[PDB]
Structures are given as structure tokens and as C-alpha cells.
Design a protein around this ligand. Structure first.
Ligand SMILES: Nc1ncnc2c1ncn2[C@@H]1O[C@H](COP(=O)(O)OP(=O)(O)OP(=O)(O)O)[C@@H](O)[C@H]1O
Ligand SMILES: [Ca+2]
Ligand SMILES: [Ca+2]
Ligand SMILES: [Ca+2]
Lengths: 368, 127
């Protein structure tokens, strides 16, 4: 695709990679952040769906764990596939905007910059924090983003355009954990979901029929005395199963980590803790601008529950506003697209010329 | 080595006491003709800079980004970002404010002595 110089936007997640063209309203490509390599022989590699389909003869790996890159060779495969297979461009022809997790280690920010310029020869690049890009997509400069995906959840307070690092909280509880949990409780119901192929099925049950109850105990009750909340689901083979209270207990783990045997605070209290770490004078603006973002925030009912739980933690007079855009699965990507399209962005990129003068550490001065 | 906006409009911003208004137009910051100040297209997003003169010789800055009921996502996201960039350019001295159609702060409404007016329509989305 390409105004004058066409910029590209890559949003790399633990579970999914979202990639496209600056100026589009949505990612052109969305695929699993998976790299498959031969168990024995052909060097060779596979990415995404195709790696999954040949899993039986490949060793599969996730280069991003909890939002942080832990395998750079495999990350480079994701990137090479993104450019040549998914977007069909030559990277040396485009400025590339990439995204990162809050608190990304210094060394990792240097390495991304290094790979882009030295392995792909991008003429220009930029790295942006995911949460800040979602805040921008929602037309705000101050607010608190609750970002929950496949491997990690973060609560990121932002003021006048920048994250407040000291108040950011990380929660290793996200979509994967939820899928696994739905597997275990559907199993306990009498069904049996334990295999890789079954995991996939459950991920889909989770995405199609799960929901957050506004009142967990009242709902366990309704479910126990009625059959009204039940739903049927068709497995790939034609068999029909019945899902009941599992629909809402699964995402309840977001608000009650003890359900997963975890000792931490749930998303509502983590959001509250981040707000209380910020200057008392901006708290009103955080509470009134709680932006939900990421695939794990797509459960029906989650906004209403976040509203209820935050309203209970904060002084009754405090105005609470939960913003949960219908497109929040791609908010990070959309923010990146808007930012990279601005007439005033030209100046913000790290150019090849800057990179050749300072090396990878230029990233700590150019991208904050 | 630097990240300085060279957009002509940044050079004109906050030089003197007064009101400056720009409209987001297809990913760009574009001046509003001063005879049109106060007539806001509800299909658009805008950026307003109020510069007040201080005793000290320096200027006080209040940056407001106004969001119309029908503005597209690229427009509201760009107004917000342009606001951050203008504040930065001005050394972080602007105080930022989000203004939503129908819910504007009194200070913001107070800038338009003959009363702010809404009008339907506006420029097409940059997407
Ligand atoms: N409709 C849905 N309801 C509930 N969960 C969903 C829904 N749609 C997607 N998810 C989940 O969202 C997750 C992927 O979202 P996302 O792309 O935002 O994560 P990521 O970017 O890959 O992960 P992370 O941000 O932790 O690095 C998966 O766990 C997926 O199952
Ligand atoms: Ca993500
Ligand atoms: Ca418009
Ligand atoms: Ca400021």
C-alpha cells in the first residue's frame, strides 16, 4: 500500500501478531505468534497457522512470553514472515513502527532497533508502548489503561501523553490462563478437554460463550436452580456439549485469581492500586478515564463489572468511567496507525542516519 | 539526534497572548480562519491553544482538544496526539484538556465571547 512513503505498523503480542499499513483503520494481518521448526530435519521454519497445522512434526515456540521477547532468532522469523508473507513488502522500502510492553528491558529495546536496521535495513523505525497507543486510539492523553491479552495484563496510568512508570503494575494472568482454566472446569463437568487440539476448541468456547457476571454469587445461584444460562456448543465432530456456569466462572478468574491458585489482586484492585500510586491530584482524571484494551477484555459484561468493582473501591462521590471500545482487540494497532500517519511524525522516527551515528542506544533518547 | 516538530504551525503557536484554533484535517494540523472561530463542525476534532500574558513576561498555556459527536477515530486520536506534541514543543508548559461536544468546561466555553456554535458536517476521515 503507499501515500508518499508508506509506513508500516507492527503490534507484536504474546499470542498474536497484528500488522498492517499506517493509515488503515485496522490491521491487514492477524496471525499467531508461533514459530515451528523441524523436530528432526528440514534451518527451515514455519509461522502461525501453518506451524500449528504441522505441529505433529514440528517443535513449536512462542518468541514473546508475557509481552517480552525471549527468543530473538524466532522473533526475526515472525518479522520476516510479517513483511514477506503477510504484508508482501520489502522492509528496506518502509518506515516501521513497532510496539512494546510497559517496562520492556533496556537491552530488548536496543535489540529490536538493531534487528530492524541491520537485519531488515528499515530506512526508519520507532518503538511505542502498547498501552499508550490504546489511550491515543480512544482520543485521550490522560487516563489509565487496563490492557489484557494472551500472556499478560497491565494497568498503566498515563498523564498528558506519557506513562507513569512507577505506577505501572503487571499481572501474569491473562487469556492463556483463562483458556487453560476453562479446560479444567469443563473437564470437571464430565467432559474431557486436555489435549492441544482440545485447547484450541476451548479457546473458542471461551471466546464465543464466556461472559463476566455482574454479581458472581447471584449468578452461581441462577445457574444452580435454573437451566436458563446454559448454552450448547458444537464440537468439530458434530457432537453437542452443554456449557453452564463455566461460561462465567472462567473470566471470574480475572477478578478472583485464587480460582487459579494465584495469590495476587484481580484486575479491578490492580487498577485501583495503580491509581493510588499516582499523585493525588490526577486521580480524578484516572478514575474517569479507565480504558480497557486487548483481547481478554472482550468478555461481555467486563466493563459493567469493572465499573461496579471500581465504584466500590473509590469514595462514593468519585466519578468512575469505564471505556471499552468495540474495537479494543486492535486498539494498540489503531493507535500506532494514527500516530505513524501524522504529518508531524516524520521528525519522530529514528532514521538510518541516526542509527549509523549512535547505534542501538539511540532508542532510549528517541522513543520514550 | 533530536525529535523536533518542524510543522509550520508549531512555530506560530503561543507566540503571543490570544486564542489559536486548528482543525485536524486528514492527519494534519490546519489553521481555522479566524473569522470562523467558534463555529465547530460536529463531524470534526480540533485543537485550541489559549495563551495568557503573565507579569513575568512569559505566557501561560491551556491546550484544549475538542471532539465532535461524529468525528472519526483518526481525528480524535490525532487531536490528542497533536496536543501532546504541542505541549512538548512548548516545554511541557501547557495544561491539557479534553473537551467533548455537549460537555465542555466553563473555561473553554468562556473563550468564545459570542457563544460557541455547533454545525453538522466536516472534513472526511483520513483513514
Ligand atoms: N471474544 C473474546 N472473548 C474473550 N477472550 C478473547 C476474545 N477474543 C479474543 N480473546 C483472547 O484474547 C487473547 C489475545 O488477545 P491479544 O491479541 O490482545 O493478546 P496478545 O497481544 O497476543 O497478548 P499479550 O498482550 O499478553 O502479549 C487470547 O487469549 C484470546 O483467546
Ligand atoms: Ca498485546
Ligand atoms: Ca470529520
Ligand atoms: Ca504539559
Amino acid at each position: 500500500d503507499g501515500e508518499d512513503v508508506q509506513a508500516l505498523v507492527i503490534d507484536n503480542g504474546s499470542g498474536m501478531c497484528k500488522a498492517g499499513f499506517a493509515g488503515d483503520d485496522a490491521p491487514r494481518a492477524v496471525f499467531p505468534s508461533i514459530v515451528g521448526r523441524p523436530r528432526h530435519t528440514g534451518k527451515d521454519s514455519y509461522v502461525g497457522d501453518e506451524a500449528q497445522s504441522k505441529r505433529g512434526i514440528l517443535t513449536l515456540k512462542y518468541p514473546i512470553e508475557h509481552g517480552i521477547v525471549t527468543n530473538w532468532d524466532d522473533m526475526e522469523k515472525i518479522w520476516h514472515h510479517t513483511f514477506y508473507n503477510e504484508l508482501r513488502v520489502a522492509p528496506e522500502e518502509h518506515p516501521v513502527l513497532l510496539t512494546e510492553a510497559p517496562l520492556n528491558p533496556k537491552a530488548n529495546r536496543e535489540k529490536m532497533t538493531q534487528i530492524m536496521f541491520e537485519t531488515f535495513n528499515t530506512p526508519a523505525m520507532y518503538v511505542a508502548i502498547q498501552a499508550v497507543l490504546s489511550l491515543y486510539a480512544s482520543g485521550r492523553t490522560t487516563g489509565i489503561v487496563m490492557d489484557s491479552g494472551d500472556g499478560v495484563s497491565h494497568t498503566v496510568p498515563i498523564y498528558e501523553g506519557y506513562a507513569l512508570p512507577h505506577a505501572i503494575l503487571r499481572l501474569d494472568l491473562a487469556g492463556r490462563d483463562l483458556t487453560d482454566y476453562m479446560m479444567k472446569i469443563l473437564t470437571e463437568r464430565g467432559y474431557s478437554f486436555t489435549t492441544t487440539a482440545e485447547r484450541e476448541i476451548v479457546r473458542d468456547i471461551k471466546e464465543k460463550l464466556a461472559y463476566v457476571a455482574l454479581d458472581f454469587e447471584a449468578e452461581m445461584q441462577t445457574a444452580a436452580s435454573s437451566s436458563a444460562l446454559e448454552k450448547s456448543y458444537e464440537l468439530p465432530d458434530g457432537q453437542v456439549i452443554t456449557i453452564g456456569n463455566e461460561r462465567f466462572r472462567c473470566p471470574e478468574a480475572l477478578f478472583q485469581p485464587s480460582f487459579l491458585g494465584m495469590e495476587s489482586a484481580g484486575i479491578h484492585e490492580t487498577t485501583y492500586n495503580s491509581i493510588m500510586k499516582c499523585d493525588v491530584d490526577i486521580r480524578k482524571d484516572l478514575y474517569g478515564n479507565v480504558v480497557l484494551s486487548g483481547g481478554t477484555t472482550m468478555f461481555p459484561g467486563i466493563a459493567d463489572r469493572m465499573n461496579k468493582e471500581l465504584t466500590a473501591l473509590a469514595p462514593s462521590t468519585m466519578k468512575i468511567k469505564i471505556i471499552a471500545p468495540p474495537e479494543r482487540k486492535y486498539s494498540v494497532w489503531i493507535g500506532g496507525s494514527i500516530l505513524a500517519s501524522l504529518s508531524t511524525f516524520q521528525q519522530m522516527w529514528i532514521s538510518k542516519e541516526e542509527y549509523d551515528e549512535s547505534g542501538p542506544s539511540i532508542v532510549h533518547r528517541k522513543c520514550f | 539526534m533530536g525529535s523536533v516538530v518542524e510543522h509550520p504551525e508549531f512555530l506560530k503557536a503561543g507566540k503571543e497572548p490570544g486564542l489559536q484554533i486548528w482543525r485536524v484535517e486528514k492527519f494534519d494540523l490546519v489553521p481555522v480562519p479566524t473569522c470562523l472561530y467558534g463555529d465547530f463542525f460536529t463531524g470534526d476534532a480540533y485543537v485550541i491553544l489559549k495563551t495568557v500574558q503573565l507579569r513575568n513576561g512569559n505566557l501561560q498555556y491551556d491546550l484544549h482538544y475538542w471532539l465532535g459527536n461524529e468525528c472519526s477515530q483518526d481525528e480524535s486520536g490525532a487531536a490528542a496526539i497533536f496536543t501532546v506534541q504541542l505541549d512538548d514543543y512548548l516545554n511541557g508548559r501547557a495544561v491539557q484538556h479534553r473537551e467533548v461536544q455537549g460537555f465542555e468546561s466553563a473555561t473553554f466555553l468562556g473563550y468564545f465571547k459570542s457563544g460557541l456554535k455547533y454545525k453538522k458536517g466536516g472534513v472526511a476521515s483520513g483513514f
